[PDB]
Structure formats: C-alpha cells, structure tokens
Amino acid sequence: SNKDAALLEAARANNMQEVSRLLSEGADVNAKHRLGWTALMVAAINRNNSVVQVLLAAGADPNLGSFKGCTALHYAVLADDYRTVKELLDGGANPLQRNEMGHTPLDYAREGEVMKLLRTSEAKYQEKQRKREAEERRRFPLEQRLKEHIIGQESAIATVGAAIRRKENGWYDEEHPLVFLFLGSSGIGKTELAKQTAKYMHKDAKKGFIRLDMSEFQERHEVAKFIGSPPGYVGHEEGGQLTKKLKQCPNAVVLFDEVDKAHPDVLTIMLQLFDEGRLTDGKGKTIDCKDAIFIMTSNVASDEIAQHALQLRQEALEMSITISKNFKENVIRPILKAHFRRDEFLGRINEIVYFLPFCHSELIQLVNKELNFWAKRAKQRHNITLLWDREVADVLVDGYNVHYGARSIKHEVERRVVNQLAAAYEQDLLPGGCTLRITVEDSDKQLLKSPELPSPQAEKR
Amino acid sequence: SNKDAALLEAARANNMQEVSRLLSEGADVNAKHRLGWTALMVAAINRNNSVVQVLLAAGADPNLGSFKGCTALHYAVLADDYRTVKELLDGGANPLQRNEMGHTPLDYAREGEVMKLLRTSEAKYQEKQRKREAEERRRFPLEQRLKEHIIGQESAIATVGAAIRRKENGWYDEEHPLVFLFLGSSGIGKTELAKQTAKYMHKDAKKGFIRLDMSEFQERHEVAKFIGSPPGYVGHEEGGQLTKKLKQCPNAVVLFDEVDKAHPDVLTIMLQLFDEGRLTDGKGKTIDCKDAIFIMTSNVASDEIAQHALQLRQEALEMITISKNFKENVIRPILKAHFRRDEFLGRINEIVYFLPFCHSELIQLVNKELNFWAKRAKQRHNITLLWDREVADVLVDGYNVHYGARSIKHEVERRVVNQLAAAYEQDLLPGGCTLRITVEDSDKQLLKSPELPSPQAEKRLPK
Amino acid sequence: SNKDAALLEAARANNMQEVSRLLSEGADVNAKHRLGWTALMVAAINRNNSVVQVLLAAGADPNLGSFKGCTALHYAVLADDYRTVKELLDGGANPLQRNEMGHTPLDYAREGEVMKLLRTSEAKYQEKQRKREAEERRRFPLEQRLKEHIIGQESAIATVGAAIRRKENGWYDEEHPLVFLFLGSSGIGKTELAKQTAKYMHKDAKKGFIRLDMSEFQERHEVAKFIGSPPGYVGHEEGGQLTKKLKQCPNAVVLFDEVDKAHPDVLTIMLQLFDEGRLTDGKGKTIDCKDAIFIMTSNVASDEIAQHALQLRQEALENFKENVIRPILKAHFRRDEFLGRINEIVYFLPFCHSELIQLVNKELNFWAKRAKQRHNITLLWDREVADVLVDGYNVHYGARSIKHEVERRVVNQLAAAYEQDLLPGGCTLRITV
C-alpha cells in the first residue's frame, strides 16, 4: 500500500528516480489512487513524459481509466504534450477510446502533433489487418507449410487448405462454424495435421489451439467440464474450460481427439454447439464461436479405409492410383451412422477427410525424416555428423507395420540405430563423420571420418 | 508487518540474537526491505557473518534477486568479508548468480580470500556437472543392478537397460514418453523388474515410483480415479489422483500392474498419456508428463509364450531366447483382438517377453531363497546356516511352472523354514546349523546342530 | 424498501422532482405499497398526469394487479381524468381487465371522454382479434403457403391442408390427437414440410415446433429424455426433450425423425400421445394432445415409394391409396398400438428432375445474392450449370446431395478465382465437364 502511494506521488512530482526504483522493486505500475488517477494518468496530465515512458516500459496500460474515465492518453492529449501522447500510443493507446463522458483523446487533443499522432496510430491499427491479410495468403499457403511436416496425405491437405481459404474469403456458409472429421488408420497424421493447422491459423498463440481429448468424456455427466457446474455447486465459479478458452480466443481451432470415445450426450452438446454456433456456460453467459474451426479425429472406419486403399493400390499395380470413390464413402457412411446414431450430426459435418495408409516411397520419406531429425539433434548437441545410405533406409522400412503407421517406423529407428548411438556415446563418439552401414542384414556403424566399425560398449562386461 | 521491519533492522545491525528471536517468532527469513535489501542482504553488506549464519539456518535464500536485483552473495562479496561469503555459499549461494545488471559475485570480488572462495564455488558447480557426467560414463551397472535381484530373463534385462541408457544419455525424443509392456507367465519377475527399475531410476524416492493396480479399474466408470470428478460432483475439489502424483514427480516411473484386468474403456484414456504424456484432470489442468516412464505388466499371451519357449528349448536341446515373427503372427493377434485397439498397441515403445526359468535358473532361485533365509538367521539370531547341492535339487523338485518363483519360495518356506522355526524353541543356538538330506534320497531333509555330528531332535509338539 | 416508499410518497404528492430522482436512482417503477396500491396507482387516483407519464416512460406497467386488485387504469378512471387514462392505455392498459372484485375500469368510469377512450381501446383489441382471424383465413390455401418454400410433394401438402381444414371445420375426430406418419427416403422435404407447416400455422418463428431424433432415445435414455428425468431419478432433467417444450405450445407440431431407430420403450410411451395425449412430463404435467400435431417419420418404408415411382408418375402427371396396407410398418412397429392409433399416413416421393433443377436454381440464386461483391455476379449459363449439377442426381440421401454438388462444382471454383484475383467484376460462370 505504501509503495503504491509513493509511486503515485512520484509520478505526480515527475520523480524519475523514485518511480524507477519503485517499479523495479515490484511496485504496482497501474496502482490507482483514491481520486481515480493512477501513476500513468497523473504523469500524462502533468506532462511527465519520462514518468509515462518508464511506466509504459514496466507494463503500464495507457487505455486504463471532470476527467472521470479518462485514460493516460486522454490526459496526455489534454496536457498538449505531443511526446507523451506519442509514447502512450506506442504502448497500445487507442486514439478513439471513449472515457466515461464519451470523449476520445482526439476530442481532447489540441490541433498540432497530438492529432497527427492519434490519426497515425488509428491508421496503423486499421492497416495492420490488411497487411496481415496480404502476407497470409502469399508465399506461404497452408499446404506449403503442411508439406514440411506431413508426408503424403496430399488429398487431405488439399481439402483442408481449400476449406480454410473458402472460410477466409467468405465464399462459404459464414453463419455456421467450419467442422472437419478425420478418419483413417492409426499413426497417419490426424492429430499431427490438426496441430499444424492450429499453429498456422494462430502462429504461436497457445490460446488459439484448444485441445480436448474426448477419452475423458466417456460418461454422461462429463459434459459439465464444457460449461462448469450450475450456480451454487462445487466449482461453479469456473464455468467450464471450453467456454473460457473460447471467449479468450473466439476463432481458436478446437480439436476433439478421438471423438468416437465421447458419450452420446457429449456428442449431442457438440451438435448443438455446431448448429447454434454459440455456447452458454453454467453462469448463463453465451459465447459466440461462429468463426471457430472444429476438428475431430477418430478411427471408426479405419479398417475399411485401410483395406480399400490397399486394394486400390493392388488394382493400380494390375494396370501397371488410390483416389477413393464417393461410393466407398457411401459404404462407409452406415458405419458412421451406426456408431454415432445421429444422422443430423453427420450431416452437420462440413468435410470428411480420409487418410490413407502410406505407400513404400512415403515410408522411405518417413525413415529419412526420422534419420534427419536424429542427425541434426546429434550435430547440435554433440557436434556429431551422422550419415547413412539408401540401403539403411530400406532395412529400417523393412520393420514397418501397417497397423501402427509412423509410430512403428519411429520405434524401429529408435531401437535399431539410436540405441547403438547411445551405447557408444559415453566413450567412443566424438565430432566427425559417423556413418551407418549394413553388413548383411543388421545396421552397423563406422568410425568418424574412417571406415572402422566402432566396438560396441558391451554392457555388463 | 512490524516483525519483518524488526528483523531487517536487527540484521542490518549485526545482531544475531535479535535476528534469531525474530526468526523464532515467525518473521519471514526472506523479508524484503523497502530499499530492496532483505535481512540476508543487509547482513551481507555489513559483514554480519553471524546474522547471515542464523538467517541461513532459518532457510534464508541467498540467490534472491546501483544494487538493483543484487543478491546477498553480491553484498557479502562487495563488503569483502570471507566468512559471510563462505556462509552464503554454504547456504546455496551461486557465484554464477546474476543480478538485474548481470553482475556476478565474482565480478564484485576483490583480490583476496573472497575472490578465491567465489572461484572455488564456481568450480564446485562446474565440477558437479562434469563429475555427474563422468559418473554417468561410469554408471553402467543397471544390468548388474537388475541381475543382482533378478535371475534369467536376459533379453528383458537387455531391452530395458538399452532403453533406459538411451533415455539417460539424451538420444531420446522429449515429445513422447517411454512405454514398456511386460508379458509372460506368472511369478517370473515382471513386477519385480518394474520395481527394481523404479528404484534404480529414483533411488528411494517414494514419489518417484507410482503404482496402480489395474485390477481395481474393472469398470468403465472407474476411469474417474485418474482425473477426478467433473465440476459440481462429490470429490471434484480433490481432483485426479494420478494427475496429482504425476505433478509431484513429472519424471516418475508409472506401473500399471496387471493392465489386462482393466476395462478396455479405461485403457482408452492411456492413449494420450502414452502418446504425448498429457492428461487433464477434472479441473482442466494438464500435467504434461512427457519424460515419465510407463511400465505395463500382463500375462495375456502367457500360455503361448511359455509353450513357444519350451518348444524352442527342446529344439535347441538337439545338439536360445529369440522369437522373430512369432510375435507378429501369434502374439499380436491375441493382444489386439482379445483386449486392445490397434492405436493402443501402436503407442508402446517396446514389448518385453519373460520366459520360464531353465533348470539352472531354478537352482539359482533356490540358492537365492536359501541365502536370504541364512542371511536373516545370521543377522537376527547369529545363526550360521549351510546346505548342499542335493538340498537345492530336492527343493527345486517341488517347482511348479504355472506359479514360477512363487512355487519355489513357498516350497522353501514349507520344507525348511517350518523346521527352523520349530527348532528355534531353544534347540537353535548361535552356531553353524547345517541342512542335510536324510538317507532317503530326494524324500526328506533334516537340520543338524552347530556340531554337524548331531541331527536335530523331534520338535516335541504333542507335549 | 426505502426507495419504494419514497417513490410512492412522491407519486402521491405529485412531486415530479422526487419521482424523477427516485426513478433515476433505480427505484422500482412498479413499487407496491403494503396496502396494495403502487406509485402509478396513487398517481392515477390523484390525477397526477405528469407522474403517470414519467412512470410509464420509465417502464411502469398499468395492468399490475373495495379497490383490491385494481390496476393503475382503474384508479385513473376512478379519478375521471382523461389524460391519465389515455397515458395508461398508451402503455398497454386493458380497459376490460377486472380487479379482484370483478369491476372493470369501464364500470368505474363516469360519463364523459373516459367512456369514449375506454371503448376505443376495447374496439382496438377487438379489431386486433378480428385482424388475426382474417390473416389466418387469408393464409389459405395453405398448399400455396407450403409451395412458396417447398418443391414437389404436392400430394402430402394437399393431404395436410385438407386434414387441417377438416379439423378446423369440425369434420374430424377432434376428441382424438392428430398424428401423421411420413414415409420415404431421407432428405426429401419431410423436415422441410414440418418446419414450413409450423412457421405458417404458428404465428411466426416456429415457436410451436418440436422436433426430436428418436435415434438417441434408448433404454438408458427413454425416461431421462422423453419424459425427462423426474425428481428422484438419476438426473433432474424433467421434461428432457419433448414435454419441456410442450409446456408452452400444447398444439405444437412435433417431429420424430426416425421411428426405425426409436426404442420399444419410447414407442410404447408414445402410445400416451394418442387416445387423449396427456403425455407424462418429468415434472408430472400432462398435455391434452387432441389438438396437437404429431409427425412421426421413417426410412424403413423408404423403398415402398421409391421402388414403385407410380405414386409419383401416375398421380395425374401424364399408386392407389394404400396399395398394400401397412406393408412393412405393421410387422416392425406393432400396428396394434403404435400405428393403429395413427390418423393418417403421408407418402414422400423421390424428387423429379424439374424439382431437382428448381432446387439447384434456388441454391445458385442464393449464392449469387450471397456474394458480397455482387457486381461480379453474372450467372451466365446458370441454367446450363444447373443442368451439369443435376447430373449428380439426388438418389442417395436427399437434396443435401444436390447442395453438395453445388458447393463442389461452384463455390470451390469461385473461391479459387478470388484467391487468384481473377474476379474484378462482371464475371460469368464456367461450364465444367
């Protein structure tokens, strides 16, 4: 309490030393005096440009509120201090924010540099969105980014990108949120594609990617987690995780991993959310999520999809490829109808994305990706150069298992190669060119920059 | 708040007695003065070695952040007091600790005792790192540690040791936990190996080893134990149990003993845990246990594994523990069809197979049990216990394959320890008690006194 | 209570300043004195015309209920002040509302302008009622009403209209609930006809519509949703899905979206819906369904119409009513109870080429106008594009197939062109395939 009053007085008195010391020592930057003025506003009204600058550096809010409701920008423009107004605008001050009396800083601003600064800030705010729109669609389509992380699944990537672009440009039913369903065998990038899409939509914003694993919603009462308990009940003050996260980021990508595990009541709530487009928490607040993107992953028809894709590959080899026809989708549909038992739920789904089991070339690409990851990790951590040959890739892919997808290749690479590297690391490995070779059927290693097979550090003795 | 001010004033005055009294009363050891100095900081700047000693004894933190963001070590070094700097370093102060401006205590030190002491502490940190690395280079007994407690199962030991070594030396993806599944007959060391691995990884730390008896999760709704109840239901405030335990020790060894007893819908929750090591409790908090180790024990393919091992050993007897495609053709359809989904098995890094003991391994088990009992007798009653090879043969004759080492354990308890406990009624004294086979070869065995020429008496129960 | 007392005293004394201050401070405009009279009532009896005006502007209700139970209109009329009565009526006061003693304001009114004003308000109410009746009469022919927003299904529309007229005109068993079973494939206007029927019959917004998916109703969900989990059961969702909405609109149009997927228990409880209705709610309330409209639907009989196409081809286009009496339905749904009580069965026919192309055209028109930069919309070859689209004929699950055809062959192309910045304005279509 004393520190806050001292900071307020220092801001009023334009005391650079006191303000800096209090801010560095943990004093609340936005401490509010009983008269309604914080350090930033008292600094702005008194033309304390240095105090305003230091407060902004510490995290002061220039948009935080007769001058009732006047923010720091309002007082800075009132004081006719162009430097203070510019500094506050640099901190995110809104030149059109209205105080309790409805007066914006522009209205309080006197003709001169203050008005120009406010107009420039408003123009920058307006044109930032245009710049983002121009940059997003150019030189970096979603498909381009996805192809970096995902191997194969070209049709799925194209479908997702086309749908996303349609939503972005408005050539779509903007009255309803965009909904996807991902199907296929295991270990083929459903969750991976969803995560990459979320990252691309929201860059690095964690709040932009709401992750829900439906395996926790196998019971009827689990729906409470979406919206929280009703008033007066245990934990009602937390109105569900989903509602809070959505209101934090309306256009967040929502992933319901393994949706098939969810209890039917949960699916009913999901369908209500999709059709309505907004959800009401347990506190009576309703949150609009029309622009949100919902992605669902499951393996309900995985076996049918996989065996049909393998049959189509074999049929194409009789011509010597895999484009699954809509009739196979009609054949699959009854399975989905039986599992979900909600014909409206399936109909509400905007897109069904099918992932195919990998072909041999895609397995080779997967093995190469894993080896590259391990090689770069070794180079970074221990300055070890790792090399391999096509034969090594063939040998590793020989361990592939269709029922597990990329996970099988990952585990095979780890056990066959990485185990040897770890065993030899403590004593033999050093910076240089370590190359993997095949003797007859097993993977062997070569000495750094020399064709000498390292002696394995036989455990025990 | 007056207690904090009094403690700060006492510390700045080099008053050990007042500082101790304030600390005992309940004054915060890390109380911060309005000028940024804490009690330890003001003690250090004034060369108050006794004050620093008493503050550290109460739990003072010398690494807490122009003197902006400085540390008690910085102030002690600035005053150039060897004793105060030494005490602060002994209390956890780091000469590599950096203040707001980035200055380290080494920088503040002037040539003399303080500079040498700070260099010594920096070398202590660096050599701690290097010596941990050197030990890890030497730390290759995990196979030895296991073989101390486990007999046979060489393939399982090798697999687990290789995976653990890989994880320990880096060389492992941090985006996915490490998962094992242990398969085989009953009483062959699955749970034993899991417990030994947990002990090795976390020494004696109880929080480091998390145990779950999946036989208690035979119902779909029982999954709530992992994550707790949702908001508005009994026990919601408590939250998940497994989530709490994982929060305590993120890198703990998790053991789902007898997992095939669980309802498949309960196993369903393990998909995320095994893939990304993330679980969200009933309150919506993720635990992010990426670097934990998950071990599952089950006997689903017990009969197939045992039969295949017996057949392989019979074949090898013509003139050892390898199965290449037998796993995929035979074991996999069992595991998948009767209990699991494909995606669940896809997340398991390694499947470990335990095979039934060979005859020599049975002899080793019998010797292990006899050694355990002899150790107990010597340690407690100062009784030395001896036996012969024929004793081991007779004991192993009672071995039962369906029960594994438990059969031998019970046999030893039944046919030997019962006689030892009955002889312990004043017929056992601290001498070389010897166990021998009677004239009836492979039929009976008796105890002999400290002096071997005398057999132990009838135990005279029907008094 | 202090604010209410102050407002009441100010209204009684005609203190405009005090009334305004109390209203601006949040005092209840409809504050009720312990003796039964409110601020508006006392202002009215005292001829405080300005106080009544300001109270009404603040939201005062002049219909709030020996003068016990008298409304503000009653008190203004008793005071014989024309201005106060006019102001109260302007706010919605009813000149015929009775107090607890059964005395209307007209009875309290004395000869003068008050009589004329109260009778004018009564005439306004009567004219409103007559206007609603005339609008409902003009709603006929309901066949045209439905055809305004539906394509095809003329037979079903005519049947529904005739049944509605018969029930309205007393030529039906009005004592018994009214129930249709709708038969055919999915997505052929069943839900569209039910929704249009609800929109037209009920005044607006389909407030009286009630549609449910009987596929989610099972032994574990029958009472918890259909009747709604009553008190003392696992869950407290009384009403659940059906009777929670029937509490407001007893004459609801109620759609059950697949009886092939309905549970035997729910199909049995649905037996209450017939005879007299009065279906038990989770709260225990029962609704007389003799006036309600139930629309069961199924696809189990979807073949009976599609396989023939005679009911469509031979219905005066260029078969017979109940060509086979309940062919599959009796064996499946126990005609003795469930279908024996159904008053009528409505067939739904596969969409014709003309109907399909009309749907395509309407969807394309929507998309054209849906365009934000409509200047770029030319719709050149729209008829030909529709001809191409209908090639993917709806023979699978309903008009949603045609909607997906339109989305695939049109929307994607336009989005791609927009992304390629090839749409400045005056843009034609493209004939693919």
Ligand SMILES: Nc1ncnc2c1ncn2[C@@H]1O[C@H](COP(=O)(O)OP(=O)(O)OP(O)(O)=S)[C@@H](O)[C@H]1O
């Ligand atoms: N198409 C892919 N390209 C590159 N890596 C992939 C691909 N698919 C999977 N992976 C990797 O292998 C791992 C497998 O996990 P997922 O892709 O998310 O499983 P899935 O394909 O969705 O099938 P389920 O859900 O287990 S039945 C991922 O974490 C990826 O790192």
Ligand SMILES: Nc1ncnc2c1ncn2[C@@H]1O[C@H](COP(=O)(O)OP(=O)(O)OP(O)(O)=S)[C@@H](O)[C@H]1O
């Ligand atoms: N040296 C050893 N080698 C193998 N097993 C041992 C050894 N020493 C002790 N055990 C026994 O191993 C048993 C635990 O192993 P488990 O394989 O989990 O048996 P289990 O619990 O019956 O297995 P299942 O899965 O339930 S069939 C305990 O009875 C231990 O006493």
Ligand SMILES: [Mg+2]
């Ligand atoms: Mg996944």
Ligand SMILES: [Mg+2]
């Ligand atoms: Mg066990």
